[PDB]
């Protein structure tokens, strides 16, 4: 909607430890943080690029802006992917944040396709073993079932409490700003301000917005960076701070808040029950691992539980006081001797 809160900002490049191939790089899809706070299993991922905006600050759901060296660039939303152990389903996107549902895995990967149609990826260690809502480790989501509490990341692209800060970026070193016009250094600034310092007497350090030529100096005696930035960016742990006490020029809200909702689970089919004095015998069809528990209803409850994997017979002692038996997500069964 109106998420013009990103207009003064830009995406950025940052350290990625596995850009593919088991090698680290400086990535436009560096991951910052993976959240797994919703008990429904949804993952909320933060990346160094911005999703849903052109480089002109205009909103477009089919576009994604990253940084190509010093210049923000447009790219295809359609090329964005999250992969973990096996490909994920992206539920939501806004700026730096991606809502995805992922299979169980140990790495988490996010990538996209740039304008030149190169794949860019980034991968982090991430144990993803989303623990089970209910008492049945099920694998197909049912219609006929019981609903239970859970938490989710809603798809609200708007106006939350949680915030990240956007600052003045630090100066950007770039060796290609300098070339060796034999015997001298030529600083080529494109259309930018360059802060430079050369370790050779005469025209040592300063600023320039024009192509400047420093005399009688070699390129490995000079340091050049792009300064006077006029777009803001997240003060990432993977980027230097521009000033000692930092800077700050704005804030961006974190979409997709954690809301508290309901999830469906199945109920394991009612077990076949046969009876003897002080004894109950139960056949169990788990369609999937189903938890079985039971307790005496006297002073000594003697809790027992086990996960039933496949079809099974269970023989239970029914004391004078009676027995309570919870079979997965069903309501408890109660038995007394006659």
């Amino acid at each position, epitope marked *: 909607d109106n998420f013009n809160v990103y207009k003064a900002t830009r995406p950025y490049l940052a350290h990625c430890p596995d850009c593919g191939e088991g090698h680290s790089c400086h990535s436009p899809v560096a991951l910052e943080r993976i959240r797994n706070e919703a008990t429904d299993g949804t993952l909320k991922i933060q990346v160094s690029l911005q999703i849903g905006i052109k480089t002109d600050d205009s909103h477009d759901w089919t576009k994604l802006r990253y940084m190509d060296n010093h210049m923000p660039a447009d790219a295809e939303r359609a090329g964005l992917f999250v992969r973990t152990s096996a490909p994920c389903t992206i539920t939501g996107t806004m700026g730096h944040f991606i809502l995805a549902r992922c299979p169980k895995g140990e790495t988490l990967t996010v990538g996209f396709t740039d304008s030149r149609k190169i794949s860019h990826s980034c991968t982090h260690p991430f144990h993803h073993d989303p623990p089970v809502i209910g008492r049945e480790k099920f694998h197909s989501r049912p219609q006929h079932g019981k609903e239970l509490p859970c938490s989710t990341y809603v798809q609200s692209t708007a106006a939350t409490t949680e915030e990240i800060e956007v600052h*003045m970026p630090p100066d950007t070193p770039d060796r290609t700003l300098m070339s060796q016009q034999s015997g001298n250094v030529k600083i080529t600034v494109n*259309g930018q*301000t360059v802060r430079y310092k050369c370790n050779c007497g005469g025209s040592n*350090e*300063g*600023l*320039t*917005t*024009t192509d*400047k030529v420093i005399n009688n100096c070699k390129v490995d005696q000079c340091h050049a960076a792009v*300064t*006077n*930035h*006029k777009k803001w960016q997240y003060n990432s742990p993977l980027v230097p701070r521009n*000033a*000692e*006490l930092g800077d700050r020029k704005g804030k961006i809200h974190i979409p997709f808040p954690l809301a508290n909702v309901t999830c469906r689970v199945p109920k394991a089919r009612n077990p076949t029950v046969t009876y003897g004095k002080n004894q109950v015998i139960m056949l169990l069809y788990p369609d999937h691992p189903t938890l079985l528990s039971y307790r005496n209803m006297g002073e000594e409850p003697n809790y027992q539980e086990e996960w039933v994997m496949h079809k099974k017979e269970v023989v239970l002692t029914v004391p004078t006081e009676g027995l309570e038996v919870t079979w997965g997500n069903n309501e408890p069964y109660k038995y007394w001797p006659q």
Partner: antibody
Amino acid sequence: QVQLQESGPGLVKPSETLSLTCTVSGGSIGSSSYYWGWIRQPPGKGLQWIGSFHYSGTTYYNPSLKSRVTISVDTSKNHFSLKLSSVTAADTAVYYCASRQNWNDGYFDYWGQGTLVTVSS
Amino acid sequence: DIQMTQSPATLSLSPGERATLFCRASQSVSSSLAWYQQKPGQAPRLLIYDASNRATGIPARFSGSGSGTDFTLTISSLEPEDFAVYYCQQRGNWPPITFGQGTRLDTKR
């Protein structure tokens, strides 16, 4: 946001060291501007940039004065300061302290109200 | 070592008129130019920067144009406020930051 006010002796004799204090109001030094600086103006003439102290600690000096100019920041008193050594009558001028808060570029958008410094014996 | 020349030295005009001022650098400074206003006895006041951008709160009648080495300041319709001395500054290649000698906008009568 911030206000700069100069503080100076006014009359300095030759070969002594002119010393000026620009005191900053409404914001701490280390956070209030991208360049602090000193710019002078002799009577009846234009402006001459003397020096600038960048927030990174780099100091940029005018080449015709670098051998005599020191600019420092005292964050314990929110003021930056100029020391111009070995003074002659040409140094007689209105001295301005100035700052650039809004872009990190090399212009000047906040100004003090300059102090006249005369040089004679 | 950038040299800045302003023109004319004196521009004596009546209020409400359009006024135009010229600044020229000894070599290309891209658009890295600024225009400062200074009224007698005061500090310079930043009017224009990067040769076209207007400083915070500067009236919309002020505007700057030009690139390379040749720059124009234009005041759409002079107000009594606007009669002062205008300097141009370079930052295209510094230090040293260098200024022009000024133009004196006198009030005709």
